[PDB]
Design a protein. Structure first.
Length: 113
């Protein structure tokens, strides 16, 4: 039994998790940038978990934007809500839209490569 793990995130403690997994460890790492006000990302949080059980190569994490906008904005987040792609060779990709089939397609391309 081998799977990705969606972990919720709040402070400078995600700076430890995001960065040190990505640039440190041989893996893809994937992170949603969402306000806690967002019913479209409320459906997506289960979507991101079912996809996680599908995809072992790839850590999963999710930031409250109201908490950590300085950094969200740096990665590239002018808009709700933005999935980032950070691998063992810096920022690979960026895509912003809650969509059920979208995310599984996106990771499939990325995690194959």
């Amino acid at each position: 039994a081998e799977e990705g793990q969606v972990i919720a995130c709040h402070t400078v403690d995600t700076w430890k998790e995001h960065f040190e997994k990505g640039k440190g460890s041989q893996k893809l790492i994937v992170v949603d940038f969402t306000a806690s006000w967002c019913p479209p990302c409320k459906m997506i949080a289960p979507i991101f978990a079912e996809l996680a059980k599908k995809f072992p190569n790839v850590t999963f994490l999710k930031v409250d934007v109201d908490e950590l906008k300085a950094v969200a904005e740096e990665w590239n987040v002018e808009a709700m809500p933005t999935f980032i792609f950070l691998k063992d060779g810096k920022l690979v990709d960026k895509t912003v839209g809650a969509d059920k089939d979208g995310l599984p397609t996106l990771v499939a391309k990325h995690a194959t490569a």
